[PDB]
TrEMBL record:
Taxonomic source organism: Aquifex aeolicus (strain VF5)
Cited NCBIfam families: Na_transp
Protein name per its UniProtKB record: Na(+):neurotransmitter symporter (Snf family)
GO biological process terms on file: sodium ion transmembrane transport
Any one of the GO CC terms: plasma membrane
PANTHER family, per the entry: TRANSPORTER (PTHR42948:SF1)
UniProt lineage: Bacteria, Pseudomonadati, Aquificota, Aquificia, Aquificales
Amino acid sequence: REHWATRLGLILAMAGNAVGLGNFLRFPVQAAENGGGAFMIPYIIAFLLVGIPLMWIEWAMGRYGGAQGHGTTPAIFYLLWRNRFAKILGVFGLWIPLVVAIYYVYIESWTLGFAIKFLVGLVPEPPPTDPDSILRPFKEFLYSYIGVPKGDEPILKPSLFAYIVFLITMFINVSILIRGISKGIERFAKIAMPTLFILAVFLVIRVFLLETPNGTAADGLNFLWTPDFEKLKDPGVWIAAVGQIFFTLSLGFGAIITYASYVRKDQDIVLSGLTAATLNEKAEVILGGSISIPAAVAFFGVANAVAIAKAGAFNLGFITLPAIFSQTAGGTFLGFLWFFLLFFAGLTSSIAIMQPMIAFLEDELKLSRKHAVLWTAAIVFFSAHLVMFLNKSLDEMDFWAGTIGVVFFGLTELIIFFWIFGADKAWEEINRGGIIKVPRIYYYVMRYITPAFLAVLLVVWAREYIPKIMEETHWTVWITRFYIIGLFLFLTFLVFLAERRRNHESAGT
Ligand SMILES: CCCCCCCCO[C@@H]1O[C@H](CO)[C@@H](O)[C@H](O)[C@H]1O
Ligand SMILES: CCCCCCCCO[C@@H]1O[C@H](CO)[C@@H](O)[C@H](O)[C@H]1O
Ligand SMILES: CCCCCCCCO[C@@H]1O[C@H](CO)[C@@H](O)[C@H](O)[C@H]1O
Ligand SMILES: CCCCCCCCO[C@@H]1O[C@H](CO)[C@@H](O)[C@H](O)[C@H]1O
Ligand SMILES: CCCCCCCCO[C@@H]1O[C@H](CO)[C@@H](O)[C@H](O)[C@H]1O
Ligand SMILES: CC(C)C[C@H](N)C(=O)O
Ligand SMILES: [Cl-]
Ligand code: NA
Ligand code: NA
């Protein structure tokens, strides 16, 4: 089995798995929509009670499976719980990353497309004070790129450039993945992470120089880091905080598990896992939190900045920030740097969510890496046409797989590993080979707190939120639901074929 060549490579690859669009695009919007500082308390608590414990559990499960030649959940869940139902639940460890990859790679392609256009100066020319006269050109720019509907039909009409850039983006992802773990993902992470860090720091510095009649970047930081204990009783903020923690740490996506399956059986995962998690958090709250929000607040003030964040998931990062940058000397190049940063952040994460399907095809169906990577790319490329042409399909996939799915899967992996497999066996497995040991208190957090926490969260979700999503949405959501349910059935069929191949292989041995 392939293995990470170096310790630093492993850490940076895992850090790249985590540090992505979630840190720079998702976090700012989530924090802004939820009262900034009022979001941070639940966020920090979720990191301590859910993020950290699940990260260790996923690293442990992956390393455990890898030692037996398995890097994906259909097989790993079965190793932990010898029940056919384990294999089926395990399918989510292939389905979630595949579905998320389908829309995540497309959004990643937008950052490459924007980076290219901003680099070459093919950007809107706002009329040099009306806030709408400046923002409108950038909104039109994004809308023409992805092809937002101008009428009643829920159809998107992406520009030819956007389509070609998606092709290029898939090719770049393939070029890295086809080289494998050590020579592909690891080697790239050693280049991309330092680059991402430098670009992010530079952008934070430039943003911190922003001062307008409406405010300064400092006003943005105060908004984000000022506690608001009167929201701690709001379920919505907690659901948002936990959701962000899962997304940003790549938890419940089967991605951490697969990457960990390449860690040598004897190698530490306690310190390594904690480090990857900490690096992500610093990149999220310190870097991601200090770019978009402070810039928006400095130029528009808090009230307007919050309204912008609530506008959409892409308004702040693809419209507002470049519009703000356009009002400064060298602003177009600053926009280029921002989108280049987003592209590298996305790329290091997209290769991580495609690797689970690749590992499954290699490990269970015995395909060569070349064939596994190409077929995985083919499925993602084909499937992405749904997200590129059907309005709000992206939103539907992000909901079932990237929001509900990951929390459900996180709870599932915890129950299977810490309850069914055995709390003490699990604890032993996590700490084996550790450079440091997991604090004793976390044994109780993992066994009792985390699952209870997630269970309650899921119940409240299915009661006070999803019913509106099942009855208050446009009929076209069923097109996406139908397709992704089909993807689940397809993956289940592949797991079925994998078990049949194993049976025939065992009979011949
Ligand atoms: C393998 C799956 C193929 C699905 C058919 C995809 C057809 C895409 O069609 C292409 O879309 C681009 C972006 O809108 C346009 O710019 C091109 O002119 C158009 O030919
Ligand atoms: C990285 C290289 C990407 C090449 C993509 C080229 C897509 C060509 O696309 C065409 O470009 C013309 C000029 O901008 C426009 O006037 C056309 O409407 C557009 O369809
Ligand atoms: C569910 C996903 C279905 C994807 C099918 C896409 C078929 C593309 O359809 C094509 O798109 C082009 C650009 O938008 C148009 O210029 C062509 O006239 C149209 O036929
Ligand atoms: C599920 C989402 C699909 C989005 C792609 C919509 C393409 C709609 O485009 C339409 O397709 C018709 C059928 O070929 C053509 O007859 C029309 O001329 C064309 O405009
Ligand atoms: C609810 C999650 C809290 C996480 C914070 C853990 C802080 C670690 O706490 C430390 O753990 C060590 C090992 O068990 C003990 O020996 C120390 O006395 C204790 O202070
Ligand atoms: C799906 C995950 C790979 C996403 C990544 N953790 C991010 O923050 O963008
Ligand atoms: Cl375009
Ligand atoms: Na992240
Ligand atoms: Na990344």
